[PDB]
Amino acid sequence: MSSLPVPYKLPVSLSVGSCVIIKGTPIHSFINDPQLQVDFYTDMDEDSDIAFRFRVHFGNHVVMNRREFGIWMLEETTDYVPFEDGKQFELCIYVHYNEYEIKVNGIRIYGFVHRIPPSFVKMVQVSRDISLTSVCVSN
């Protein structure tokens, strides 16, 4: 009604210089392990490979990884998660030549190096404990 379906699937084409911009609000923040997940898939089904998963445990940490043929690779984390319960955030994922750069409300929190070319990404999926207002791919 007032927000997009979650989980949400958007077909995309990414190039160097692209930015995936997600606007939403953390909800259910009183539960034990509230989360946000963003997956960059290489095809339209959820069994396809994942170039980049960004999984936030709100108030705790972010875990990032890549899946090929069902197998997860080298996991990366940071405890820098500057979201606010019940307040809208702007999550920007910039596609650079060498990495995805993740900014939360304008502040870089991480850079995840490409394991496969970002041009291989065909779909972005947003899931878990958010209300989702908008998603798009800019430039």
Swiss-Prot record:
What Gene3D superfamilies does the record tag this protein with? Answer: 2.60.120.200
Keyword set includes Plastid: no
What GO MF annotations does this protein's record show?
carbohydrate binding; lysophospholipase activity
An individual GO BP term:
phospholipid metabolic process
| InterPro entries assigned to the protein according to its UniProt record, in alphabetical order | ConA-like_dom_sf, Galectin-like, Galectin_CRD
UniProt superkingdom = Eukaryota
Chief location category: cytoplasm
Function field: Binds beta-galactoside and lactose. Strong inducer of T-cell apoptosis. Has hemagglutinating activity towards chicken erythrocytes.
- Assembly notes: Homodimer; disulfide-linked.
Q: What is this protein called?
A: Galactoside-binding soluble lectin 13
Q: Which organism is it from?
A: Homo sapiens
Taxonomic placement: Eukaryota, Metazoa, Chordata, Craniata, Vertebrata
